Structure formats: structure tokens, C-alpha cells
Amino acid sequence: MPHAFKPGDLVFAKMKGYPHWPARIDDIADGAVKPPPNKYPIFFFGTHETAFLGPKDLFPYDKSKDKYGKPNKRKGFNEGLWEIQNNPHASYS
């Protein structure tokens, strides 16, 4: 069965103004800013930016890649597709 999101989970994450975007659930460093209730730190592949999003905007990757995994013209998107496929757990900092 599915569980609550945890660090390392791979998703497509939806933000306003962007296509559903390859991403992963990150962990929260000690003393770093914590998310709002029921939100998670989402690291976006390709752009390497992080935002706080809730589960309504998070689509498990395996289930959703046929729909959301096609290349596009957005800055960083195709690199993000490559990173989630080839080295999703790497350090990109």
C-alpha cells in the first residue's frame, strides 16, 4: 500500500505556471526552515530549486511518468527528466 511521503520519494510536482515537474521529497536539515502543516520540501530536478508543497500537488513518479514524462521546452525540464531517471538521489548542490 502507499504510505505518507518520505525523503527520497520520487514525484511529479505541480506549481502554478509550470507543467507537472520531476522532483523528489527532500529531508529538512536541523534548525532549517520547516514546512507549513502538511507540506513537504520538494526538490525540483533540472532547476535544482526547492519549494514547500502539499500532497494534492504530488504525483508518484512511476504511476504518472507516461502522462507527465514527455520532453518540453521549459528551462531545465529535460535535464530534470534525465536526473529523475538516471541519478535521482544524487547531491545537486
Side-chain angles (χ1 to χ4, degrees), residues 2-5 7-15 17-72 74 76-93:
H3 304 280
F5 284 113
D9 288 351
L10 302 184
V11 297
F12 292 83
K14 185 65 166 85
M15 298 208 55
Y18 300 95
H20 294 75
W21 202 282
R24 66 181 190 213
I25 310 298
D26 259 10
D27 201 348
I28 295 290
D30 297 339
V33 56
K34 289 176 179 57
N38 205 24
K39 295 194 180 178
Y40 289 87
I42 307 306
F43 178 84
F44 292 86
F45 295 111
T47 64
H48 314 136
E49 298 297 343
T50 299
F52 294 142
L53 293 175
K56 74 179 180 71
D57 290 318
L58 308 175
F59 297 77
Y61 173 72
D62 273 348
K63 173 168 233 284
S64 309
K65 60 170 186 301
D66 286 354
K67 183 183 292 180
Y68 296 138
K70 297 314 184 258
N72 69 47
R74 303 299 299 269
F77 189 89
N78 288 346
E79 172 61 27
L81 294 175
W82 179 90
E83 289 176 359
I84 197 162
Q85 182 164 37
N86 292 274
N87 206 340
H89 304 300
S91 166
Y92 286 96
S93 54

